[PDB]
Design a protein around this ligand. Structure first.
Ligand SMILES: N#Cc1cc(=O)[nH]c(=O)n1[C@@H]1O[C@H](COP(=O)(O)O)[C@@H](O)[C@H]1O
Ligand SMILES: N#Cc1cc(=O)[nH]c(=O)n1[C@@H]1O[C@H](COP(=O)(O)O)[C@@H](O)[C@H]1O
Lengths: 215, 215
């Protein structure tokens, strides 16, 4: 992705979301849109963004249901024009396979969320995350998400998925993660609040890119 | 809930969803609406249903993000008129507490999904589910979801949460669960396809209720 930086656009107002995304568009190639924006403004916002900004859109829907419901969520999400969807691994292989089947049908991609970035991830997800990643490899998953806030776990995840797999990583900035350290292991970093809550989101994005280029 | 039966309305067309819900409204008082319907027809469908049918609405959004994102999802979902939201416990206590805080602010309820009903739940979720349920109890959660497809696990869940907690259970019918056995432990059953894919959804609901009344 352009500059190895993905904008997490979690503003909950179409006007603010459009303003900030337009201000930082020169510095990115992909926008992650999640439920805060979609549930506030509708699924139509995905195709609006994709057209207006000519960016790729990852739907961060943390898909975490039974196989049959997962298939329906993926179908609706790709129909809305998303390029990829983020799916939890913790509910197991059949739930992940359902999403992979729809992505295959529709010519799109699945990202598998292994370990989450927030403190509570330590309770249950962290102890299963290596096995969730290995499950991903066995299912043929090629795109993964893992935590900026724990670079030793990001390293272990990269070890499991290999160098050919694509790995993106949230928790940079607001949650405490560092762009340069995270990019030792991940291919791209996700950044939300550090950019979209900044007084000057373009300046915040540019500052991040400047530290990335230096690596 | 009326007749201990909650309709899982996962049709993805407003006209079909309205038809079936109207046909079975005499047999229920609560409708579970999830992402298949919401992502196809918009969040406004929640208030439409609540008004048209005068039913309680549980938003089954399997909420499974970091605390800050969970808060935004819950806020948008209650603003849309939902009475309650279903939240995963696997991501940990901070993520669950975020949802509880918004529910407290807005006068609504959180249901904690412990163990899921599909086969893949056995991989990772089942081994954590007793601890997820105990975490719920410690956080003061009073409403829980657990699997019709494993009544021995539903029994263990009920043991952890006590008799005062409210427990609803999906996986009845299509996934293999039985209404009567599940209601030995759960307060209410969730039923989707066995009703909404039936040639006569009212007859399917009535058939289920006749077997419930007999218990
Ligand atoms: N993908 C994802 C997800 C999984 C995870 O483990 N940690 C995250 O922060 N996220 C999402 O990434 C973004 C992080 O944004 P921020 O830079 O912390 O403001 C949010 O959309 C959050 O919901
Ligand atoms: N709530 C929930 C959820 C958690 C779980 O462990 N198992 C489920 O089936 N569900 C949901 O309950 C409904 C079950 O519907 P059905 O009766 O199997 O057609 C679906 O909306 C499914 O997504």
């Amino acid at each position: 992705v352009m500059n190895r930086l993905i904008l997490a656009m979690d503003l909950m107002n179409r006007d603010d979301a459009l303003r900030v995304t337009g201000e930082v568009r020169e510095y990115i190639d992909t926008v992650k849109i999640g439920y805060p924006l979609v549930l506030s403004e509708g699924m139509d916002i995905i195709a609006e963004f994709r057209k207006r900004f000519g960016c790729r859109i990852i739907a961060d829907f943390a898909v975490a249901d039974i196989p049959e419901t997962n298939e329906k969520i993926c179908r609706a999400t790709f129909k809305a024009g998303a390029d990829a969807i983020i799916v939890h691994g913790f509910p197991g292989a059949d739930s992940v396979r359902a999403c992979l089947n729809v992505a295959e049908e529709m010519g799109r991609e699945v990202f598998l969320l292994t370990e989450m970035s927030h403190p509570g991830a330590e309770m249950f997800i962290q102890g299963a995350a290596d096995e969730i990643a290995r499950m991903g490899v066995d299912l043929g998953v090629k795109n993964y998400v893992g935590p900026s806030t724990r670079p030793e776990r990001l390293s272990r995840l990269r070890e499991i998925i290999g160098q050919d797999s694509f790995l993106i990583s949230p928790g940079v900035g607001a949650q405490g993660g560092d762009p340069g350290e995270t990019l030792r292991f991940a291919d791209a970093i996700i950044v939300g609040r550090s950019i979209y809550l900044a007084d000057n989101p373009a300046a915040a994005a540019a500052g991040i890119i400047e530290s990335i280029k230096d690596l």
